[PDB]
Amino acid sequence: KNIESLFDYSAGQFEFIDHLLTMGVGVHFAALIFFLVVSQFVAPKYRIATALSCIVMVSAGLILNSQAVMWTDAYAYVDGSYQLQDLTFSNGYRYVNWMATIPCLLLQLLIVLNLKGKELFSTATWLILAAWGMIITGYVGQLYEVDDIAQLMIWGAVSTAFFVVMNWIVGTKIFKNRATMLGGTDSTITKVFWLMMFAWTLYPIAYLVPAFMNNADGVVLRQLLFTIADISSKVIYGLMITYIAIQQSAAAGYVPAQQALGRI
Numbered sequence: 001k002n003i004e005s006l007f008d009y010s011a012g013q014f015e016f017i018d019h020l021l022t023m024g025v026g027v028h029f030a031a032l033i034f035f036l037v038v039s040q041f042v043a044p045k046y047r048i049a050t051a052l053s054c055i056v057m058v059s060a061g062l063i064l065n066s067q068a069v070m071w072t073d074a075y076a077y078v079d080g081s082y083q084l085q086d087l088t089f090s091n092g093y094r095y096v097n098w099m100a101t102i103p104c105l106l107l108q109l110l111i112v113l114n115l116k117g118k119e120l121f122s123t124a125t126w127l128i129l130a131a132w133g134m135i136i137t138g139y140v141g142q143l144y145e146v147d148d149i150a151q152l153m154i155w156g157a158v159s160t161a162f163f164v165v166m167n168w169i170v171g172t173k174i175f176k177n178r179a180t181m182l183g184g185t186d187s188t189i190t191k192v193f194w195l196m197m198f199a200w201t202l203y204p205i206a207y208l209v210p211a212f213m214n215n216a217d218g219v220v221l222r223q224l225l226f227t228i229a230d231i232s233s234k235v236i237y238g239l240m241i242t243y244i245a246i247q248q249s250a251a252a253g254y255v256p257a258q259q260a261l262g263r264i
């Protein structure tokens, strides 16, 4: 059902995809240890935002590791190229994982925005429903990336509608609650918005690769885009979320945060 299955791969193509996925694992588990260790410097009100980065790191790291082993299981070097064996490789599993990781990314943002109570629960609920709409409709569309490109486009448009509405919820909350934020993080949080707009848009671009580059180099491009997108949307984003948490914590008087920021 997926374009990866259509092609044989050069050793270069195959080894590059393997290295991209493997590097992805390493970056996410490296960042995991950073988040774990810095969490002690985060005030209770925010500490779950840092814990969510740990959860996203393992989740994304495990999907990348899964993809990497599936890639090596699926292909063997036969008659001068890597050819499909009995097991299959697919990006479908990333979609399933987004059902968990996207809500985690959105919740960590709501936490540092100082939302709480009813507003937090209601905002999270609408964001998660929009996210799930996006992800499910996209998952369905990509089943057609070989057999019916028109269907892939239409499901893609539906998904993009959910995306745009989600992004409008996010920006609305960010630009409304920016003024509650401490320690100068009212400025930092605007950069977080733009980082999300940029990084998250890489996913629909990857989605469309079967429409504009249906060949083995397109397969490579798609994995490359997911790699850039994962690192930006999870790791760089989590690092900014954690900086914001620690800075707000120190401004609120949490002494471990003040001491951590002091000794750097």
Ligand SMILES: *C/C=C(C)/C=C/C=C(C)/C=C/C1=C(C)CCCC1(C)C
Pocket: 098, 101, 102, 105, 134, 135, 137, 138, 139, 156, 159, 160, 163, 200, 201, 203, 204, 207, 230, 233, 234
């Ligand atoms: C860490 C993983 C992240 C942030 C994943 C984000 C995924 C998206 C923003 C996906 C969006 C899509 C569209 C807007 C249209 C095409 C189908 C999807 C699901 C790829």
Ligand SMILES: CCCCCCCC/C=C/CCCCCCCC(=O)O
Pocket: 012, 013, 016, 220, 227, 228, 231, 232
């Ligand atoms: C936020 C940035 C994240 C960067 C992650 C990506 C790093 C890897 C960069 C690779 C550059 C391209 C290498 C050349 C491709 C060879 C093509 C081939 O034969 O398949």
Ligand SMILES: CCCCCCCC/C=C\CCCCCCCC(=O)O
Pocket: 022, 023, 024, 025, 026, 027, 028, 030, 031, 034
């Ligand atoms: C197994 C694959 C290769 C091993 C990867 C190990 C190298 C890790 C490099 C970067 C990971 C990013 C983690 C960011 C932590 C904070 C960075 C910082 O404080 O500047």
Ligand SMILES: [Cl-]
Pocket: 043, 044, 045, 046
């Ligand atoms: Cl607190």
Ligand SMILES: [Cl-]
Pocket: 059, 060, 063, 094, 097, 098, 101
């Ligand atoms: Cl993920």
